[PDB]
Amino acid sequence: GTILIFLDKNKEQAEKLAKEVGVTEIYESDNLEELYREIKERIERENPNATILTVTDPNELKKIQDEGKVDRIILLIKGSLEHHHHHH
Structure with a gap:
């Protein structure tokens, strides 16, 4: 059973792909x-x-979903508030 993950720092890129590829699990x-x-x-x-x-x-997610050889597809998106602390 195959699991397909998509990771992005930007919400619009993941939203726009989900709408063109037909995926809902965000x-x-x-x-x-x-x-x-x-x-x-x-x-x-x-x-x-x-x-x-x-x-x-x-282009990679679309190439895998073209073939449809997958049992679940999941999109993960980064929240806007995360930054590391720095001292120099």
């Missing part, structure tokens, strides 16, 4: 990179026969 968090791990950890508990696919470009 998640958003300031901790985008920790959320990815927290989802994949639960995939490993729920799907012992999992296959991992992960994307950052709509």
